[PDB]
Design a protein around this ligand. Structure first.
Ligand SMILES: O=P(O)(O)[C@H](O)c1ccc(-c2cccc([C@H](O)c3ccc(Cl)c(Cl)c3)c2)cc1
Length: 287
């Protein structure tokens, strides 16, 4: 209700199951939601172009992650294409949604990880997309970016994701980081492709809980940081809503996401996929 009027459709199990399989209603509902995209002219900062994968997919100013070191007063140094994202119940800064780093933003991305104390990164890029959708921003073993030693301590190979256990060191303080590289993102978002995404969501929220009180923001990224990123975060919020309230409101969750970052859940097929994932989870909980 701050940047646009929020919409809601509270779904119980039966309606959730049926809604997932009604593409005609899904498209009518989806295309009524404002994208809440930022006018590109909002960001006329010299050199900004080089920091963006897509010139029209920009962070909404009110929720933008600003890089406060080494110059908070420099519009370029402080810029990253990223937004703080509210979680379930409107909890502030549960996630940060960001574009997949490009060659020129690899160091900015690690500046953001350190500033935010981020304990978990969720990367939604398939292996054959590693060309123009994400740069390999992590090292094979070790790399230093702006006084911070990043060490890949272990690679855990699973069916649907690669988990990297990363160490971050600067001076005397050392931090842990979990990097979830999901490699099972489907082109055809049929119900049979929903289980790996659901598994990833469950694993990440459990790892988030294990960080203990006041978990620092969880970074989530895909190419533009809105489509797949939007799905992941909406699914994560709705799983907590279903467990707490016994209902799901994908519509209201999508509206809340869009208020934080324009275009979250970019396509109708992504919107339906979220319904397939939530319908699947509801059946699993029911046992
Ligand atoms: O960004 P999106 O809007 O979602 C857009 O639809 C979209 C979704 C996926 C892809 C994509 C990219 C590379 C390789 C593949 C593989 O063909 C593949 C991999 C894993 C699985 Cl599990 C499957 Cl089924 C199929 C798919 C491209 C574009």
């Amino acid at each position: 209700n701050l940047y646009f009027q929020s919409m809601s459709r509270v779904l119980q199990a039966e309606e959730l199951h049926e809604k997932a399989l009604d593409p005609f209603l899904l498209q009518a509902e989806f295309f009524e939601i404002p994208m809440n995209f930022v006018d590109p002219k909002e960001y006329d900062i010299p050199g900004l172009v080089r920091k963006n994968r897509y010139k029209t997919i920009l962070p909404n100013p009110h929720s933008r992650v600003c890089l406060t070191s080494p110059d908070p007063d420099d519009p370029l140094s402080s810029y990253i294409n990223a937004n703080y994202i509210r979680g379930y119940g409107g909890e502030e800064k549960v996630y940060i949604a960001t574009q997949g780093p490009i060659v020129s933003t690899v160091a900015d991305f690690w500046r953001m990880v350190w500033q935010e104390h981020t304990p978990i990164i969720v990367m939604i890029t398939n292996i054959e997309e590693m060309n123009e959708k994400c740069t390999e921003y992590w090292p094979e073993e070790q790399v230093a970016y702006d006084g911070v030693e990043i060490t890949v301590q272990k690679v855990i190979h699973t069916e649907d994701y690669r988990l990297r256990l990363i160490s971050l060191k600067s001076g005397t303080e050392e931090r842990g980081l979990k990097h979830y590289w999901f490699t099972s993102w489907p082109d055809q978002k049929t119900p049979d492709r929903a289980p790996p995404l659901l598994h990833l969501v469950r694993e990440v929220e459990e790892a988030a809980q294990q960080e203990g009180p006041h978990c620092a923001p969880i970074i989530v990224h895909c190419s533009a940081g809105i489509g797949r990123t939007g799905c992941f975060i909406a699914t994560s919020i709705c799983c907590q809503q279903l467990r707490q309230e016994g209902v799901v409101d994908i519509l209201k969750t999508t509206c809340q996401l869009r208020q934080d970052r324009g275009g979250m859940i970019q396509t109708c097929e992504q919107y339906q996929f979220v319904h397939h994932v939530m319908s699947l989870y509801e059946k699993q909980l029911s046992h």
